[PDB]
Amino acid sequence: DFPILCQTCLGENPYIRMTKEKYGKECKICARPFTVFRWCPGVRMRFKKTEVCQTCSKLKNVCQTCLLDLEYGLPIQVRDAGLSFKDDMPKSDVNKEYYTQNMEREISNSDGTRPVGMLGKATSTSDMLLKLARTTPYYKRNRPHICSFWVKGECKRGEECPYRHEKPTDPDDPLADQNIKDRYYGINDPVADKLLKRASTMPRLDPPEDKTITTLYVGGLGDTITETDLRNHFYQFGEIRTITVVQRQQCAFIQFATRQAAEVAAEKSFNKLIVNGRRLNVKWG
Amino acid sequence: DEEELNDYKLRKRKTFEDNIRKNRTVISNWIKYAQWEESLKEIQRARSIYERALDVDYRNITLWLKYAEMEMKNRQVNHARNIWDRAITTLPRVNQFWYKYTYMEEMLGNVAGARQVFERWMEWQPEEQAWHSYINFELRYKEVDRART
């Protein structure tokens, strides 16, 4: 009873009518019958319905319809590229059936609210994916499918047509093909790969222009801030060597015992840290 | 290589599974399968084989020795440590497990660990020889007071 859901599926209305079938469909993964839920998300929306059984969601920690993580809204291949691939799960036939069975007993014996072993891992995060995690609901995802009479030029329902009248996606784009099983296991997922390419460009971690340099060239200081903000932020890292301050261009230089600590302060800092409700931007030299 | 080796593995692997399914037990089939995967250094597979064999017959002491041995051969100290603990927990009466367990710890250098193991062992009030081995263990170091105790 009650599905497991994204906030993005469930709807942008707080009031929702949602129907239930006892054994509605096989799950497209572990292939068992399971309680299925439909509901209307919104005014122009599509009537989504749960695609996979609740168990294999608890297993990989995901929405039932979307298969996007609960916290990050990221396809599974991504958050695995983000932490731990070694979760695994047999893809192969009768194994899948077997492992699902056992893991279904293991889950039965848990407190109920926890994605099994992954959650022991799931706490430690934020490497990148937080910064590539999506922020707001994305409703373009629930729109009705593309009317396929109209996309041949004919559709004779006129304005009534609940489907959507517009140009489809060119089958050329590798982002088209998108199997379900595939998106689930984290194989060759085009979306996930795209997000990976997007991850790399994040100006961030390579640093190291020069050896031993712990000099921090800090842009976007501002004249509200004091140094004491700086120190009481940065004593976490280690033994400071010193701090140079310039308020004429509002840039603050810093120096630490080891370069390692400076890299760190970059990492922890870059395009993340803000104090005095004002962004504190960092660069090398 | 790349594909040619692979096919070989399917024929062997499949055969192993067939043998097991036919006879179910007869753990020489289990063991041979484990050994083959060990030889190919697919030791994660090997582990699963050993665990499956244990599910069939957890009392079989050769099986456990082969399992622990496999871990040790591949320098997987902590796996071996786990396994030893399980073996003595479920089949405490088997002295072979205890003798090997203490030996392993001694080789690793963990005298304290070995002492702990022996103290567990002694709770079972075992056999004259076990007590002698514990005393001798102590006497490989000076530790005369311990021995007397």
Partner: protein, 107 residues
């Protein structure tokens, strides 16, 4: 569980669906609640008009031709009356192109 009067549920659901503003249900939002939960452009303007309650003002009716006597044949339209008003080329092309591409991909 909850045991909300069904009728009130309908009132809130339609209110939101139609106008975008419905009073929010929460228990511990502040541990006391003073607030609406809609887009709210309508809510300030429409003063929480309920779907069941008559709207204060009426606007913009659209006509559908009707003959209701039924004496006539073929003639007669009942509540089957097809809105008189409602009977891109630019787009008409992009879609086609996409289709072509898809076909090619099938190859």
């Amino acid at each position: 569980p909850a045991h909300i009067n069904d009728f009130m549920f309908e009132q809130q659901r339609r209110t939101f669906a139609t106008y975008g503003y419905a009073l929010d249900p929460s228990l511990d939002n502040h541990q006391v609640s003073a607030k609406y939960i809609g887009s709210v452009e309508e809510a300030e303007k429409n003063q929480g008009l309920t779907v069941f309650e008559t709207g204060q003002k009426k606007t913009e009716k659209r006509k559908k031709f009707k003959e209701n006597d039924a004496s006539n044949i073929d003639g007669f339209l009942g509540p089957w009356a097809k809105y008189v008003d409602e009977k891109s080329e630019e787009e008409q092309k992009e879609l086609d192109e996409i289709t072509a591409k898809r076909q090619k991909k099938g190859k």
